[PDB]
Amino acid sequence: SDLIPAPPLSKVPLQQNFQDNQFHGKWYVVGLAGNGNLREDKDPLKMYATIYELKEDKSYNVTDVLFIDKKCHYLINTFVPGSQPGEFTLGSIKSTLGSTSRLVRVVSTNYNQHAMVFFKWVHQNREWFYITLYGRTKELTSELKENFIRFSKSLGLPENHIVFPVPIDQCIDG
Amino acid sequence: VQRWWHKGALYRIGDLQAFVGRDAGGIAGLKSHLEYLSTLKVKGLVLGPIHKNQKDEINETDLKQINPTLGSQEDFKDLLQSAKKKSIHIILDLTPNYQGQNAWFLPAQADIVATKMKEALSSWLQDGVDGFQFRDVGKLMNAPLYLAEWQNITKNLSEDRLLIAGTESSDLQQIVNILESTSDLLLTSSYLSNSTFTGERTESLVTRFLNATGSQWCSWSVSQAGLLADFIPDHLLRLYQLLLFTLPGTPVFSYGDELGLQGALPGQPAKAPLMPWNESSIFHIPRPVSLNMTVKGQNEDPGSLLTQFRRLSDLRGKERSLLHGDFHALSSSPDLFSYIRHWDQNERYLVVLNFRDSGRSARLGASNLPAGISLPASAKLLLSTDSARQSREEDTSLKLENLSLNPYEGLLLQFPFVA
């Protein structure tokens, strides 16, 4: 199946009593880990920003702020809610077995400093899984960055598949 | 020495603006992406339609006039010449009323359309195009008659020119009737998309079609226009890619098939998506997974569809058995479709496709094959569609007698003639 295999969702925690309002607004990607690509170009991946804008139907208008080919680019997507609060899906859901195929899950957050979000994306009998370490600033302490590595490694990711996107300023500073 | 369209895959580009983006004009911008198209090893581009067409007005439809939006006649000559240097031929789609509901105008106007077509064919042939495509021929009064006329018109002016017919039909008899009306005519259809997608059904469809078309050089597609990922379930995309490249004939793809690109959702206006060169032209895919679903993203990725497409397309281009080899189906376990490609004493190619979501023994039976074709004890694995196995066993020797396949796994193995 996978070169670097995926963990079961039974081994991925869910942030208890998820406050979708407190989680809203801009997050900087301080850390990124996963079994997929971790670079856009030939150099290490540069920091990007994700804005979770809570709609009235309690889905997220999610906007990724990207600095690519010396211009600002914006990926706009819809995180539709799943079974529990803090879980979301992406695109048109076909099956109930394949309702978990494109899924986002908030692991932990204190809402006003740090957050950890799990991504699942199936692609031809293989699963891309990522862990995003979010910050309200571009900096986070060694303890929080160490917690991210420990949790990343615990889901079966080597150290060379865990990166801390190089902080930038263009586009992501609003 | 064989026809140029025997030598590799065809690559359909319906919306030149969507393939290029907002950065440049359709025809001029297409020229700049030829280097990329060379890496895919495609032998022909099926472009357009690009001609002037006022929705459902026959007198305001000119098959010789290029939509000025896309570019000029001068821009199109540059493309033809640029492509010629790369050994890439240009097919022009001339489906007349492509902006309207009835593709061939009203049934009673067939006679007027045919005269417009006759005139168009001569002009474009002079301009230096190497063939033409006609889609929705199910909506054309006397399609067999007109396709024949247009072949006669094309052949009368040159020998080494290709005509492609398209249909929405998945019906064997309908497809054969159109094929038999005209010689050396490729026909794209929904034949391979109208399926339970079980191994026995896939084997049945392929073997029945080859039995009906006998010795004729077939084409292999999943539709006349649309993306493969819109018709084939996600779990079979790699398996179908292997199937299409290794069946005897010319495989036909649309731009984005090498990426696994999907078109408009069932709740959107049915119009072609942007070719995602980078993340500045992708839709419905957020970070961080978006990093994996662009041309730039899949380019360096060993386990991407773009890598499998390039690998299989390269083999299809240079191996004589895959270029113009005979085909023999093998007996195997239920829902495994195994077959051999062979030309004279050149390398044999053994293909084994597991269409089940479980480990399965191939149980290959080769007893009824012609003399001189015998399975050896072991054979070289060139490509598994299972990325896990490909990263561990590519270019390794596998024992055939106890051969087992992973869920939805496809194997391409190689073995030489033994003298």
In terms of DSSP bridges, do strands B89-93 and B336-342 run parallel, antiparallel, or are they unpaired?
A: unpaired
Q: Residues with Cβ < 8 Å from B104, sequence gap 6 or more?
A: B95, B96, B97, B110, B113, B136, B139, B140, B141
| Selected residue of B285, B289, B386, B392 to mutate for chain A interface (largest A Cβ count, 10 A) | B289
Out of A32, A34, A126, the one facing B387 most closely (by C-beta) is: A126
d(CA B82, CA B61) in angstroms, rounded, equals 28
Measured CA to CA in angstroms, residue B305 lies from A6, A123, B223, B237, B277 at distances of 19, 10, 19, 9, 15
Question: Which residue in chain B is spatially nearest to A124 when comparing CA positions?
Answer: B235
C-beta atoms surrounding A42 within 10 Å: 6
- Crossing angle for the helix pair B199-213 and B172-181, to the nearest 10 degrees: 30
Say yes or no: B287 contacts chain A, CB-CB below 8 A: yes
Q: What CATH number corresponds to the domain at position A86?
A: 2.40.128.20
Measured CA to CA in angstroms, residue B403 lies from B45, B377, B413 at distances of 39, 10, 11
Tell me, which fold does domain B321-415 have in CATH? Immunoglobulin-like (2.60.40)
Going by C-alpha positions, the residue among B234, B282, B4 that lies closest to residue B131 is B4
Going by C-alpha positions, the residue among B5, B261, B219, B291 that lies closest to residue B130 is B5
Backbone angles phi, psi at A137, to 5 degrees: -115, 170
Place of tokens 């370490």: A133
Task: Determine, for residues A124 and B391 on separate chains, whether the beta-carbon distance falls below 8 Å.
Answer: no
In terms of DSSP bridges, do strands A127-135 and B378-384 run parallel, antiparallel, or are they unpaired?
A: unpaired
Cβ neighbourhood burial of B251 (10 Å; 0-12, 13-18, 19+): buried
Task: Determine, for residues A75 and B285 on separate chains, whether the beta-carbon distance falls below 8 Å.
Answer: yes
Positive or negative torsion for Cα A74, A40, B12, B194 = negative
Q: What is the DSSP letter of A46?
A: B
Question: Which residue in chain A is spatially nearest to B284 when comparing CA positions?
Answer: A77
Cα dihedral B308, B309, B315, B321, rounded to 10, equals: 110
Cβ neighbourhood burial of B268 (10 Å; 0-12, 13-18, 19+): exposed
C-beta atoms surrounding A86 within 10 Å: 22
Task: Determine, for residues A66 and B279 on separate chains, whether the beta-carbon distance falls below 8 Å.
Answer: yes
Q: Where are the domains of chain B?
A: 4-320, 321-415
Enter the tokens of residue A96.
Answer: 């109930």
d(CA B345, CA B357) in angstroms, rounded, equals 36
DSSP run (H or E) holding B78: helix B73-85
Q: How far out from the chain centre does Cα B238 lie?
A: 14
Range of the domain at A116: 1-174
Enter the tokens of residue B27.
Answer: 């025809």
Task: Determine, for residues A64 and B287 on separate chains, whether the beta-carbon distance falls below 8 Å.
Answer: yes
d(CA B65, CA A118) in angstroms, rounded, equals 53
Question: Which residue in chain A is spatially nearest to B301 when comparing CA positions?
Answer: A37
Number of domains comprising chain A: 1
Q: Is A169 helix (H, G, I), strand (E, B) or coil?
A: coil
What's the reported resolution, in angstroms, to a tenth? 2.8
Going by C-alpha positions, the residue among B202, B179, B204 that lies closest to residue B189 is B179
Place of tokens 């479980």: B358
Going by C-alpha positions, the residue among A149, A113, A158, A109 that lies closest to residue A131 is A149
Judge whether B386 and B406 are in contact, CB under 8 Å: yes
In terms of DSSP bridges, do strands B61-66 and B89-93 run parallel, antiparallel, or are they unpaired?
A: unpaired
Place of tokens 């859901």: A93
Task: Assign domain B4-320 to its CATH architecture.
Answer: Alpha-Beta Barrel (3.20)
Going by C-alpha positions, the residue among B191, B235, B209 that lies closest to residue B354 is B235
**DSSP characters for B256-282?**
TTTTT-----TTS---PPP--SSGGG-
Residues in B touching A119 (Cβ below 8 Å):
288-289
Place of tokens 């010629």: B84
Q: Is B236 helix (H, G, I), strand (E, B) or coil?
A: helix
Reported for A6-10, long-range contacts at CB under 8 A and 24+ positions apart, including other chains, are A6/A35, A6/A120, A6/A127, A6/A129, A6/A156, A7/A129, A7/A155, A7/A156, A9/A100, A9/A103, A9/A105, A9/A120
Task: Determine, for residues A124 and B305 on separate chains, whether the beta-carbon distance falls below 8 Å.
Answer: yes
Q: Is A67 helix (H, G, I), strand (E, B) or coil?
A: strand
Judged by CB atoms within 8 Å, which residues 291-320 of B form the interface with A?
A: 291-292, 296-297, 300-301, 303, 305
Out of A29, A40, A130, the one facing B289 most closely (by C-beta) is: A130
